Structure 1
Amino acid sequence: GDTCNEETQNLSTIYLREYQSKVKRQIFSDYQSEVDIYNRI
């Protein structure tokens, strides 16, 4: 019923959110700057 359509939207959005996280793992990782742990600690 609207269930068929809510379940479609809900499975669809879980498929989109997962993909948006692979994308963010791609681009935000360019900003990651490692720490010299032996230096600050």
Structure 2
Amino acid sequence: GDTCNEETQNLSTIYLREYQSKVKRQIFSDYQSEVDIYNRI
């Protein structure tokens, strides 16, 4: 039936979404620009 199949799909998508977050933390952090909060306010 599908639940075995649907659980391997759900679990494999979770481990992937998690690794993808690690990669986004690397490559998107390069674009983060810090703000001078004291002159902003």
TM-score exceeds 0.5: yes
Query: Shorter-chain TM-score: which interval?
Result: over 0.9
Tell me the matched-pair count: 41
Q: 4+ runs of 1 displaced by more than 4 Å?
A: none
In structure 1, the gaps of 5 or more residues are none
- Between the aligned residues of both structures, percent identity stands at 100
Question: What is the alpha-carbon distance in structure 1 between the residues aligned to residue 27 and residue 9 of structure 2?
Answer: 27
How many angstroms apart in 2 are the aligned matches of 1:40 and 1:14? 39
Distance 1:18 1:11 in 2: 11
> Considering only aligned residues, what root-mean-square deviation do their CA atoms show, in Å?
0.6
TM-score normalized with structure 2 length? 0.93
Q: TM-score, normalised by structure 1?
A: 0.93
* SS of equivalent residue, structure 1 residue 4: helix
